[PDB]
Amino acid sequence: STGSATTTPIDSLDDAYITPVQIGTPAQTLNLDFDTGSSDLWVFSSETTASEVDGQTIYTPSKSTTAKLLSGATWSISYGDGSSSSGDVYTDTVSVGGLTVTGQAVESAKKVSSSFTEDSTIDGLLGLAFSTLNTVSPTQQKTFFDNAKASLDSPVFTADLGYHAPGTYNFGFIDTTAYTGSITYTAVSTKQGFWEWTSTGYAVGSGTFKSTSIDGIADTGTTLLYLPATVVSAYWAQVSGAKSSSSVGGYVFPCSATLPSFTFGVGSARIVIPGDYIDFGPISTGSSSCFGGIQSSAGIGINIFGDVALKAAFVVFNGATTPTLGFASK
Template identity: 75%
Template structure:
């Protein structure tokens, strides 16, 4: 998939009620009114793997994996599991370095989301996700948010370019990114996720930044976080400044 997916953006975003997991002064609004920034830091849990990176590229472009590569991937994921003492993950160099903490609900539930410029759904691991599909991810529980409401009859299903997929139902809730809040944002709660997402234990979901016309919610498409937020920004744009091992910013209206 075309994305900052698995370019995971690890930004520690400020929001009320989430200070316990966010260092002071990280992700605070920029000084200029109508402009907000989220600061990213490197994911220190990231494990580099040549075979896994190559296999990811093969799968993305739907090219069958040679037997030798399949064997290398099997050996590599096994060694990753033993080294970390956790369930098998599929880390890839260069495009899984950063995740962005996003606050959802009241009080805030902070999830690390993958910002994706190739899709338009904001979906998360949730209390509705089967336990067998959860592998250390933080989940969103709408029943614990005083500002959540279920969008009756709404469902969603998305398949990405690498054939990873997820689906479920939809809630409306308060969402905050880098000090910028949307009070009635569609939050798509996963009832099913593919193995690729289960294996990615640091990633709690995706926040799509593409055109809202690509949103998969039916029967009525929902706007992206950015489309809902842009009227409160000085300029309707976002930027990302990512550098290896460096703390940098993702800006909304920069």
């Protein structure tokens, strides 16, 4: 089996991407944030505290003939931005792009934090990290990918995120028409439950490539690229007037600037992020200060190759017995 679904930016900045997912019988279609940095499939639901729902589409398990309460199971998660959600669990049929899993754990939110309520466009998350991070208690549950894997033609999924445009998540096959050149594969550590790998270095604009090992995670759920402070300082030093603002929460730059590209290494290969991809627009409406797309990971504890980096590539999440990651230009 295979599946293929289009993923669409939620706004003009690519702050996140949503992918339609069919849950239950008859299908209830919810738009979920596919997140390779977490491992819970959770949804706004008929059980979500009413004051915490504001425009999202909800899953109603009582209207699904295939929904079953997973008795006694609860979940609770916090994310890297400080947001959180929690609730109980059903099993139901879940389909993505024509690929169907029966008995998938669908985590129904009873509570969500304010950032979720305030974003009408995201109806939940679909985690694609390793199932060891799944928060369901007392019986940990498997991700959609983990459940589908043995049925897939090949035990892989791919992320092809667009810059200010839709893109694609594929399951079970590698679309050889979706990238240029060859895919470079690189080793993954699953020790922390993430798609964790080591970049071989970086360049700023047309500058020389600096060979240096940068350990980080491929995280489709994260908007920005978070790298060591040394690397990030070297990037922003090439932008006149750029500075790190503690009041804003990171590097900002004059909206009149032309941003340089940023290159990261994958083995002996190179992925080039165009400067435009690093522009996240005015810090507040009408401001001439713009928020940067490359930020320091200091204080996070891990480097994060988020959407800014991943959207510059065709990315293979290879879930074979020894997982690996592949990157191609496109």
